[model samples]
Target: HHANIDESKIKDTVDDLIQPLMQKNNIPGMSVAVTVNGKNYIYNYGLAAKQPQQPVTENTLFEVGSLSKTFAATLASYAQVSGKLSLDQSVSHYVPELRGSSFDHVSVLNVGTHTSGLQLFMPEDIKNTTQLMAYLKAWKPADAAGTHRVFSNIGTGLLGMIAAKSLGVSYEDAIEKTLLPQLGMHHSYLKVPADQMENYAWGYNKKDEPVHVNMEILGNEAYGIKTTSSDLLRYVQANMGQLKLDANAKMQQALTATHTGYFKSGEITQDLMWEQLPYPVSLPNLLTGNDMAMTKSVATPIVPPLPPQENVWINKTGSTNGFGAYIAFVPAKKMGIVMLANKNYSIDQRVTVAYKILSSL
Candidate 1:
């Protein structure tokens, strides 16, 4: 049993902590929801559009940027567990043209973990996996494999492609058929469906700049997911063991696995899809670090066995031109949080303030 905390005290702490963050970061809009064990408290702040004309609500959908990678990672992991493919088998094993390329040394795990030595983005957009395979076959890495942390969108992007190829379906088909239905997130989509355009929140650049980013892109897995805090809350709940999918628990298992650290960069340590962060830092400091988590890596960069007194935070964040969003949880404390902003604030800011508010409870 633990000490009981009063709701007023909790509210006071949350208000004191988040209000200043809103002003300081110039974040135009945000929706915050906290779940302590099974209880929940949600708040929507700022505008759906930075222009002050649009309103935001708990149901408004936003583009969650790279945080979508966790979904890609989850799919990859599920493919592995489903007998669709093996993580240890190589790209050449699936696509024979990959033989004798730098990618040959790379495993599916490397692509998932950002250790693939692939560049941040491809030199140019390739027409198909055949072209993409050719590019990798001729590719040369500036940094040795697993020696540098490049944080490549292209790296994760390729992983997503491989996952779809292994399953023999379009990437969108793979996700919709697998994780989205499993999480009961009917509102979330890899691509914009024709009917629901009005519900999407408009994302703005830092100074209220305008851009039309919700437009569909060819690579849905790399950076194309639109959702709301409620949709993501279902996602968090599923990971928290509150939701179940009979197709296979592999998707759920993949999500939890992503939270385990596989790489280290400075104070930030990376898990499969989730990033683990430590600190009681304010929003700005966290966002400035690009929202990467730092695990305590001793001499060999081994993840620490003990949890930080501050917290062992596991989170996934996303953003696109018209949307920015975050989903996070603390396993030890049985708590989870989701913060989605119509404005393009970084994921670090989203998690920093949201987690700070939720932890006091």
Candidate 2:
């Protein structure tokens, strides 16, 4: 059952808030929904594609990229809380081949916090479980085991692999069977299914033309999730505890842990899958000056941290060539927003626009 808000009033604000950005960026299609006290305020605009006449809607799908990491982290935490695994334990406890690899010194907690010091992606040589094992066997640390922080996709993949073993199932199956069902997100999919493939939007390259992202390199745990507004609102509802389920309490706590900043990297602290920063930070001058008109409209906060601690907002931004997304929560205010777009906007633009808009709410 879907809950309704005053769409007529919300639609007017949606147009004022998003349509301007769409026109400025040439972003032809997008979907956005905000929830206040568990009620949805949404608007879908522009065409589904440059060629399609169909209008964008709440059901339009977009690949959520690393925003998906939040779910992966939740699964890892759930495994630990459910007696299936231990967060402090070495990953080699589940994958024996990793016993002597650089990960021997790495804890599952390190993997989730972006401190594993692993490189971005597993090599192309990794094709299956055996190859994944082989890659781990040859894995080397890029930095001191747990020192400086860099965004590491391989780090999260290891978490996914470890959590899968602990749960005795494929990571995809584990999430689909255990996580999604518990969260009541029926329209979400860990792996794209045949029947719903049409819902997945096509992405374009810098040439401003359609392009296909390399799925194998892109589908690892660090990124890769496709969802619609209604589906993703379910995710926000889960985080907000508005959706009741047997796992709601546990999942909320587990996800909250991921949202916690674990390691301080100057103004930024490495949170589970989020980059924590303060707000009102300097604007990337290039964006502000290049688009002066928008600079005035784009509300810049006064003080910004690497991850803003202001408004008690904890957020994660995600993207790929054809998609951009974010999930932000202001726990103190019980307000949250989920934004997903089908255009290949620069990550900075997607984040700046989203934070600016959502903060106002």
Candidate 3:
């Protein structure tokens, strides 16, 4: 009923688009996974470890950084749909200690959408929950809740913490036992398993120094996820409604809820974790959306959810010191792309490569 992609040409097209960027960026290792019409192709490039000269593979685990927010959002959405919690409820309802704080006026949906007006990071001195609570009590918002879309590790981090509290489980246990399994992402983990440790990709900072997060609850919730290209492709498939979980109906509803665009930030639309744009969008616009000028811009005011539309491209970008990742999908086209690297590369390069490849198809 529609134009179909020529699968045989996809790999070469991706190679033409990505190989140059990898070389120019000095990325030691990388993975590119693409799915079209339920067909998946993953290309592994460069070394997983420079010292040992290990080859990157489909199973090479890399820190997915802020892309973890999308998973946290998914769990929160499922929690909402399953009647475990309501997104409209104040976060204080789950963590009573936050009762008198500004969170009393902030809903879980605000946090999930990064519209809570929370700062981008937890205060450096706020190391533990007690300290975090004290900080929250003393803090004042620069803007009112739900009024702007400041990208906040603290906001999404709180969503993860509240989801765990709502489910009566540790945050790690909840993701490990529930969300990963349901998405058929068996190999992905918030904390990589000991047996799978060999597959973990070492990350590098701007100095090319080896680095990984010393994870705290909020930090882990915010940016700490180690996963493989193979596992993540399944997640993309699941997002596209191509991969089915056992509770297909509930899972579908949760996925749909996550994609509902709740705000517009300049040229880009904000879904729960993904940023979106209409199909046939220009590269300059796509680049601008991913650029620091927009990504790091002050949060914008909320707008009504756009009337449901198909054929839109939704994406998210993630990075730690030594790692970078980008994921995007077009639901109407039933296609998606994910790129993960072991070194910090410009968001510009990642979007450029993805835009070229996805557009060609």
Highest TM-score among the candidates is held by which one? Answer: 3
Per-candidate TM equals 0.82, 0.84, 0.94
Query: How much is the lDDT of residue 289 in candidate 3?
Result: 79
TM-score of 3: 0.94
Best by lDDT: 3
> In candidate 1, what are the lDDT values of residues 69-116, reduced to their tens digit?
878887787777678877667766776777787777777766776766
Whichever of 2 and 3 has more lDDT, that candidate is 3
Candidate 3 vs. truth: CA RMSD?
Answer: 3.0
TM-score of 1: 0.82
Question: Each candidate: what lDDT?
Answer: 0.66, 0.66, 0.82
Off by over 4 Å in 3: 1-8, 292-304
